[PDB]
């Protein structure tokens, strides 16, 4: 039987300061007991001063980040180049994720 999911390992960490924020992640990508890559970037600059990581199944992780980056682009087109605030980005990502409620993106997302 075909299993549409996989586990690419990885660990990410987000901390909010008083006037700053950090999003960190290891660069190792794996399946089972093998290393796929020692440097595969996992945390991404998505524009509008937002950084994002979708950790877990890397195919879903890459798909989500890609669709959110795209959502930032179209937010600018549709709303006169208005900056996407972090709270608005968060609500948007909820809808991206819940859209696949019955076939989920197998990731834990942090922005």
């Amino acid at each position: 039987q075909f299993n549409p999911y996989g586990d690419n390992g990885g660990t990410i960490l987000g901390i909010a300061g008083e006037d700053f924020a950090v999003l960190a992640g290891d660069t190792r990508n794996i399946t089972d007991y093998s290393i796929n890559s020692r440097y595969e970037p996992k945390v991404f600059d998505c524009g509008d001063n937002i950084v994002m990581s979708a950790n877990g199944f890397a195919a879903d992780g890459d798909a989500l980040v890609k669709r959110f980056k795209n959502s930032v682009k179209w937010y600018h087109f549709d709303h006169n180049d208005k900056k996407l605030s972090i709270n608005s980005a968060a609500r948007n990502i909820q809808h991206l994720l819940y859209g696949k409620r019955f076939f989920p993106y197998y990731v834990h997302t942090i922005i």
Binding site: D78, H79, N80, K82, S85, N87, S88, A90, R91, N92
Partner: protein
Amino acid sequence: DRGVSTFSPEGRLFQVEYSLEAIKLGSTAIGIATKEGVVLGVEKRATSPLLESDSIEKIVEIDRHIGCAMSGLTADARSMIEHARTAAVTHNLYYDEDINVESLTQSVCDLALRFGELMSRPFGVALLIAGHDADDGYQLFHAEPSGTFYRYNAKAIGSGSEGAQAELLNEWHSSLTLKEAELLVLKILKQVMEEKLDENNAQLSCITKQDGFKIYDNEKTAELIKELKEKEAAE
């Protein structure tokens, strides 16, 4: 006969141009934008004295920060209002914020040219959309059945529009107060209306950042009408 989406030899869509004629027959609606708020006012124009005039609803809320006035075939406006309200609420659901006044207006205007042989004809109503957002402050837009929308410092639509617009040309300046705008709408409505203006055949409304969109009570408007009469008799 001929297509509903046909161009004239001058390069204009027949049906759109004809709907503009229906809007000219509509009751007058006026909007004035200031740095203290945007005022919206309409002529109710009841067809008979037995018609309860407070059931005439030509000023409508779209969201807390966006109001709207109409002129022309007002039954056509209902689905436009329904769309506007849905778009405003949907954007808040998707983005946890207020929608920009321009974006709301653009969403409404996207419906306009969706006619052919979609709906069977253009809308026969024009809208004055007024509101406030953090990026561009107080705004007033004129949404037409052509799909075009212009931003205005002040604008009149309906049967008394060209006389009213000439009056708005002279009276508007960038330092108008909200109170000054209220009286100005009342003054110009009184000028172009057939019947004598009072609190039952005319309606006022405004949008401010603090209190949002508010339709004025007949008692509140009646006082502003009395204030207008006295200041015109003052010279």
